[PDB]
Structures are given as C-alpha cells and as structure tokens.
Amino acid sequence: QVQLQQSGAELAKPGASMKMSCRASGYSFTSYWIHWLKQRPDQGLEWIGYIDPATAYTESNQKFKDKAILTADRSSNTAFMYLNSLTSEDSAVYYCARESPRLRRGIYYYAMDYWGQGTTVTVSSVDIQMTQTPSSLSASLGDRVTISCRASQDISNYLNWYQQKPDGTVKLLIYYTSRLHSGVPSRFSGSGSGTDYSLTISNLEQEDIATYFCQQGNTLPPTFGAGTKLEL
C-alpha cells in the first residue's frame, strides 16, 4: 500500500531558512513524480512545483521561483523542500503528493493520487482561474447533491476532484472528468465539457461530510478552486 510520511511541525524566526522531508514506502519511488503544495488558513491550495526522482529534473511556479528549492535521494526513498527569507506570509500547512500513472506515453493527467499528512510551519519572533459554486451547502442524510465548477478557458476535460476532512486528510475521488479512483464507492459521479463541470453525490452518508475542491491540469501551473463545504 502506497504511503507518504512527512516531518514534524516547526517554528522559525523571520529571515531564516528551513528544510522539511517526505518519506516514501510501498512502491517504486523512481517511477512517479512528487508534487509540493501550500494551503493557508481557510483558503484554497497553491501548487509550488514537482521533481522527477529518476532524473532529478524540476519544474517550478514563477511565483515561488526565488523562494523554494526541491531535491530527492533515491537510496533513502525521500524527497525534500527548502525555504528561504521567511516572513509571516509563509506560515501555512505544506503537503507532498504523488502523480498518478500516465494517460499514454508523454501525456499525464496532473492528478495527485496519494497524499502525505501535512507539515505546519509557524513564523514568529496568465493563470487559469477556477470558480466553484456555492461556497457552502447543507443537506440531510439520503439526499442527492450536486456542486459546480467553471474555468476561464477550455480545459479539454482535464478536470479532477478531491476531498479534505476536518483533520487535514486529503484524498482523490475522480480524475479526468468522470473516472473513479481505487476504492471510491460508485455513488460519486461527475460530468462536464469545455469550461463547465459538476460533481454529484447520491444517497449521502455521514462519512461524506467534508470540503470539496476542483482542479485543472491542462496547462502549467495547476490551479485549484476555493472549495465547497458540505454540512448536515
């Protein structure tokens, strides 16, 4: 079983540097990319970059190009991220996540199929826009519910959906508009095309209470929606 284990919470001084790690077990580390992401209090996620462990090649978001450096060591099955010139804007939860198996030779989904548990950092002494509606939505057990997602440009069906629980745990539910991931119960379904997409949950259960994110992976950098909170 795939597993990603991240390092423990740290505090730091303004102006300093720091280093955090992500240890892999239960699969061939050199066969899939590792991604890094940032999430601020009560906000959506931002994508920082990825590294290919087999070749050491890296890709970075222009917004983080002076802020972060990514590395990997194959023998110890571990990836790393280094940050510099820390400010209060840098206090956040940081995550690592694995890239899913490809679509065909040279064509990836940009769907993150397994996630680490997050590291909390405290500092103390044109992009494609996604729009999710509504921002929160209440329902009762056994109901049918649908949520909507729009992008600012044709994303040609490269649209993915994730679920985040109150304790931070993140998982992939659907990739490439309508494909279920391993272990997802078939009461989850999705549809769309062009710029307009939706997710539908049939026969709600109490373990479905959470926050839901959409994400395009047509063009770099990957961008996320701001979330829909689903409550009883």
Residue numbers in the entry: 1 to 125, 399 to 505
Task: Please quote the authors directly.
Based on the expression yields and purification efficiency, the scFv C1 construct was selected for detailed characterisation and crystallisation trials. This construct contains the alternative variable light chain VLA and the L1 linker adapted from an established vector system for expression of single-chain T-cell receptors (scTCRs) and scFvs in E. coli, which was not previously used for 14F7-related work. The crystal structure of scFv C1 was determined to 2.2 Å resolution. In the scFv C1 structure, four molecules (M1 to M4) are present in the crystal’s asymmetric unit, which allows for an independent structural comparison of the CDR H3 loop. The loop cannot be fully traced in the electron density of two of these molecules (M3 and M4), which likely reflects some degrees of flexibility. In molecules M1 and M2, however, the CDR H3 loops are well defined. The CDR H3 conformation of M1 resembles that of the 14F7 Fab more closely than that of M2, with main chain distances at the loop tip of 2.3 Å and 5.5 Å, respectively (dashed lines). Another region that showed disorder in the crystal structure is the L1 linker region, which was not traceable in any of the four molecules, suggesting increased mobility compared to the rest of the molecule. Structural analysis of scFv C1 revealed that the important CDR H3 region adopts a similar conformation as in the 14F7 Fab, stabilised by tight interactions with the light chain CDRs. The position of Trp33 in the scFv is identical to that of the Fab, but at the higher resolution, additional water molecules were identified.
The monoclonal antibody (mAb) 14F7 is a murine IgG that binds selectively to NeuGc GM314. One such antigen is the ganglioside NeuGc GM3, which contains the sialic acid N-glycolyl neuraminic acid. Still, NeuGc GM3 fulfils the criteria of being a tumour-specific extracellular marker, which makes it a very potent antigen for targeted cancer immunotherapy. A scFv is an antibody-derived fragment that contains the heavy chain variable region (VH) and the light chain variable region (VL) tethered covalently by a linker.
